[PDB]
From a paper:
Previous studies showed that proper introduction of disulfide bonds could stabilize the flexible region of target proteins and reduce the conformational entropy by locking the protein into single desired conformation. Here we developed a comprehensive disulfide bond prediction algorithm that not just increased the success rate of predictions but also improved the quality of crystallized target proteins. We applied our method on two proteins which were previously determined to high resolution and frequently used as fusion partners for GPCR crystallization, cytochrome b562 (BRIL) and Flavodoxin, and verified our prediction by solving the crystal structures of the wild type (WT) proteins and mutants. The theoretical and experimental results both indicated that with relatively lower values of conformational entropy, proteins would be more stable and readily crystallized to higher diffraction resolution.
The continued disulfide omitted electron densities of the side chains suggested that the disulfide bonds are successfully formed in all crystallized mutants, which are T9C-A36C, A20C-Q25C, V16C-A29C, and [name]-[name] in BRIL and N14C-C93, A43C-L74C, and C102-R125C in Flavodoxin, respectively. Compared to WT BRIL, three mutants (T9C-A36C, V16C-A29C, and [name]-[name]) show relatively better or similar diffraction resolution, lower conformational entropy (ΔS) and comparable B-factor. These disulfide bonds are located near the middle of helices I and II (T9C-A36C and V16C-A29C) or between helices II and III ([name]-[name]), thus directly strengthened the linkage between these helices. The BRIL proteins with disulfide bonds T9C-A36C and [name]-[name] have lower entropy, consistent with better diffraction qualities. For BRIL proteins, the distance between the N- and C-termini exhibited small fluctuations expect for [name]-[name]. For BRIL proteins, the simulation B-factors are consistent with the experimental values.
Residue numbers in the entry: 1 to 106
Write the structure that this text describes.
Amino acid sequence: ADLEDNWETLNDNLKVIEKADNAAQVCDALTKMRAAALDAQKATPPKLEDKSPDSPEMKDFRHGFDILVGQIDDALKLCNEGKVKEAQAAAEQLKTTRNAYIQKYL
């Protein structure tokens, strides 16, 4: 699985969360999102393949993932307390982070 696969795993699990009926279903999908985000964070996106590994752009990319992972953790805390609707709303905001931090490097 590569970065493109990781991104599409995030997309599929966002759909799972949107369609979910219970906290356990949301938790499972957030787990897969967290795993895919950890995998993606270690990749080099195509627009940064020539850039220095410590370039500001590569920092932006990796830090977008630390922010995304922290937000996934906040959503996991909600679904671990049974707060399904709150967790689903939080998952929607994960789209904003993904789009603003990461998409420009794909």
